Amino acid sequence: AAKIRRDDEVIVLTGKDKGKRGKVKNVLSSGKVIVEGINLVKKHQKPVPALNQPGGIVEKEAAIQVSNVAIFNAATGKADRVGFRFEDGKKVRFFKSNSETI
Amino acid sequence: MKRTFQPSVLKRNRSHGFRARMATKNGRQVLARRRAKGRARLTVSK
Amino acid sequence: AVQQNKPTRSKRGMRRSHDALTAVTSLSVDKTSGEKHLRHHITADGYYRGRKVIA
Amino acid sequence: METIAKHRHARSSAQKVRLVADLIRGKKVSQALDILTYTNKKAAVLVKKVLESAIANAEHNDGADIDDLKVTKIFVDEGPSMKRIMPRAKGRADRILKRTSHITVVVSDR
RNA sequence: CCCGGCGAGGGGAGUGAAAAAGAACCUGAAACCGUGUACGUACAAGCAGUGGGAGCACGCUUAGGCGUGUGACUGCGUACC
RNA sequence: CGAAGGUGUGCUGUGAGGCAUGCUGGAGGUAUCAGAAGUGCGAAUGCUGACAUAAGUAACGAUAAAGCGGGUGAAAAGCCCGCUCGCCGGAAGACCAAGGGUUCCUGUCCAACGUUAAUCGGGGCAGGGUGAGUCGACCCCUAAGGCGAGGCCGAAAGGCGU
């Protein structure tokens, strides 16, 4: 299974945004994620008469490596690691610092 | 001045075609060699 | 007939020492319109020596 | 202040463009334009366009005045060549070179 | 945004640690071709250097020197395998 | 807090060489003592790629031939329209087989191709166009010749023939 999933809360470990927090928007197959408000870029966009769209300089998000973020533990206020286990008949994830189910 | 190549499709096919190659034991050896080398075109026939 | 030794860049330059172009000394001004033109030629608007010749 | 303009990959030989480039080195811009207008060579059109581009750049990007400008530098360099085949007698083939040049013009107010 | 043929090509603005990393895109040697500066060169005969040697330009100066570039005139001197 | 590689400068040994440092470059290098070799290039009318000279020199492919006005266009000797001149006419006119395979028609573009310019093209890009009981092929019949059930012959492979 996968340790990081869509609609999670994460904290950034490396790069120019080291320390910030956000929500995971979607997961790509190459091993990257798009987090909200993180890793912003300025694109010079050309206009197109079709679709009724003008040009301009736009700010958007860019993908970041999955192993550069971590799952945030609100109880402790810190970064954490993820483990797997079976509870009733089904698989679940759990925090390794305090052994609590997610 | 008349030159050496003077084309004719019927003669081309009767001289170097697939069925001509198959009709004799040495022609099959030609085909086997060409298959082993891996040619995209095996004979002169379309 | 062909050379026996390869000529040098110095010789290339010496031969080309007679190839420079010459610029026109001066132009002329028409007495009515004020344009510049080649002497003894008409202007680009159609004047010569003060008179309009071509429409 | 110095302003540059360039034409890269021009279809001509550097030896042929240098003959025209030599005419306007160190002149005022009005005098140089007058000289170029009455020279019956193909390289003259190309050189004139480059000079006009340089003047417009100096007007728009650096706020210069046209009446104070001089042609402070100018040069021509050799570019890549194209290779072609030309047949000759008795089944022999020769090689043809099609040469190109880069043209650079610098104007200044000093 | 600007010159140009609603071109090819370029100059600004902007991205980025870096644009002589701009798609003919890591580094970018040599043959070969140009622009600028200093000195020599239009009464002088040959493997083009080597030994001697004025004059000019320029940098230190411990004001005594010295270093670097060029080189009029003169002895000797017919490449390599 | 700058590795290999590139380019200068200063010192040093009898030589092949060594050491230090400025600028460029942007991630690798390797003491000492031992061990192994695809271990040192100027020549072989050597092998591959790049660039010179002669030189802006020869040449631009039948001596049937051109002139002027208007149009479009950034630009017209060569493109479009008009009037005149010239050349072939048992062909340098018209229709086919063999061979080729979209070169055919309309719109749009001028980098490369066109031995010059090109607004033009058998060039680039997109769209359209080939309608059969009687024309041909396929089909029925055989020539020269080819293949050939059984058959005759030949170490094998194979040869000739009803």
Experimentally determined by: cryo-EM
Count, residues in chain B:
46
Q: What is the span of the domain harbouring residue A2?
A: 1-102
Q: What is the span of the domain harbouring residue B39?
A: 1-46
Please, are residues A24 and A34 in contact by the beta-carbon 8 Å criterion?
yes
Structure tokens at B24: 């004799």
Q: How far is the CA of D58 from the C1' of E53 (A)?
A: 55
Q: How far is the CA of B45 from the C1' of F130 (A)?
A: 26
Spatial separation of the C-alpha atoms in residues D16 and D56, rounded to whole Å: 26
Q: Residue B24 belongs to a domain with what CATH number?
A: 1.10.287.3980
Spatial separation of the C-alpha atoms in residues A40 and A83, rounded to whole Å: 31
Chains with ≥3 Cβ pairs under 8 A against B? Answer: none
At position D88, the amino acid (one-letter code) is R
Does residue D60 reach within 7 angstroms of strand E, measured from its CB?
yes
Spatial separation of the C-alpha atoms in residues A91 and A83, rounded to whole Å: 10
Please, are residues D101 and D40 in contact by the beta-carbon 8 Å criterion?
no
Q: At what angle do helices D14-21 and D42-62 cross, to 10 degrees?
A: 60
Spatial separation of the C-alpha atoms in residues B16 and B46, rounded to whole Å: 12
Report CA-CA distances (Å) from C54 to C32, C40, C44, C46, C47. 15, 16, 10, 5, 7
Report CA-CA distances (Å) from A100 to A23, C4, D46. 21, 95, 78
Which CATH architecture does the domain made up of D1-110 adopt? Alpha-Beta Complex (3.90)
Report CA-CA distances (Å) from D81 to B35, C15, D14, D50. 43, 26, 12, 22
How many domains does chain B contain in total?
1
**R_g over Cα of chain D:** 17
Beta-carbon-side half-sphere exposure of residue A43 (alpha carbons within 13 Å)? 11
Q: What is the resolution of this structure in A?
A: 2.0
Q: By CA distance, what is C39's nearest residue in D?
A: D38
Residue with tokens 């530098």: D73
Spatial separation of the C-alpha atoms in residues D15 and D41, rounded to whole Å: 13
Query: D22 touching C, CB under 8 A?
Result: yes
Query: C29 touching D, CB under 8 A?
Result: no
| Cβ count near D58 (within 10 Å) | 23
CA distance D60 to chain C (A): 28
Continuous H helices in chain D: 14-21, 29-37, 42-62
